[PDB]
Design an enzyme around this catalytic site. Structure first.
Site, PDB file in Angstrom:
ATOM      1  N   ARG A  95      41.264  37.120  38.338  1.00  0.00           N
ATOM      2  CA  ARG A  95      41.362  37.429  39.762  1.00  0.00           C
ATOM      3  C   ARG A  95      40.606  36.449  40.632  1.00  0.00           C
ATOM      4  NH1 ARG A  95      36.668  40.904  38.243  1.00  0.00           N
ATOM      5  NH2 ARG A  95      35.207  40.661  40.003  1.00  0.00           N
ATOM      6  N   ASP A 128      31.573  39.620  34.519  1.00  0.00           N
ATOM      7  CA  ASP A 128      32.415  38.676  35.248  1.00  0.00           C
ATOM      8  C   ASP A 128      32.038  37.264  34.862  1.00  0.00           C
ATOM      9  OD1 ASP A 128      34.129  40.368  36.663  1.00  0.00           O
ATOM     10  OD2 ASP A 128      32.882  40.437  38.492  1.00  0.00           O
TER      11      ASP A 128
END
Length: 145
Positions: A95, A128
């Site tokens: 993303r 992440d």
């Protein structure tokens, strides 16, 4: 913010097709809340959150505190999920997060691949992976690594 050349419709966000995928999609969409108290409800007590390779948060309290600290200096203005998928109890989001520094107004596009682990629908782990070169400037908190 365009779709990349390499984006695959087969793993598009709109094609999420398991409970865990749908929960994780919902969560990264809720990041634009800038709201730690709402976001912490997605986490199990036994959990962790890390921006690799910065010091990790383990435990719901630590996660809540670091999310809260983030939203005092940064707004997550947009999250754009190109891919979502899952394998072996892990969920992946490929993303882009758009972070805006609250004291400068400067905006940053971070290309992120994140992995999530859920237990009974609650987040057990969240890591992440992205480039932190602009992260130190973007978040007006001392990096602890």
């Amino acid at each position: 913010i365009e779709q990349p050349r390499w984006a695959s419709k087969d793993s598009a966000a709109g094609a999420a097709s398991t409970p865990d995928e749908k929960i994780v999609l919902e969560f990264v969409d809720a990041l634009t809340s800038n709201d730690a108290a709402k976001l912490i409800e997605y986490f199990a007590e036994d959990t962790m959150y890390q921006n690799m390779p910065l010091p990790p948060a383990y435990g719901r309290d630590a996660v809540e505190q670091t999310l809260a600290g983030l939203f005092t200096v940064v707004s997550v203005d947009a999250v754009e999920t190109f891919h979502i998928g899952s394998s072996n109890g892990l969920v992946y989001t490929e993303r882009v997060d758009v972070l805006r520094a609250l004291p400068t107004g400067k905006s940053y596009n971070f290309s992120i691949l994140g992995v999530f682990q859920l237990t009974e629908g609650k987040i057990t782990g969240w890591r992440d992976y992205f480039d932190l070169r602009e992260f130190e400037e973007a978040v007006d908190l001392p990096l602890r690594g």
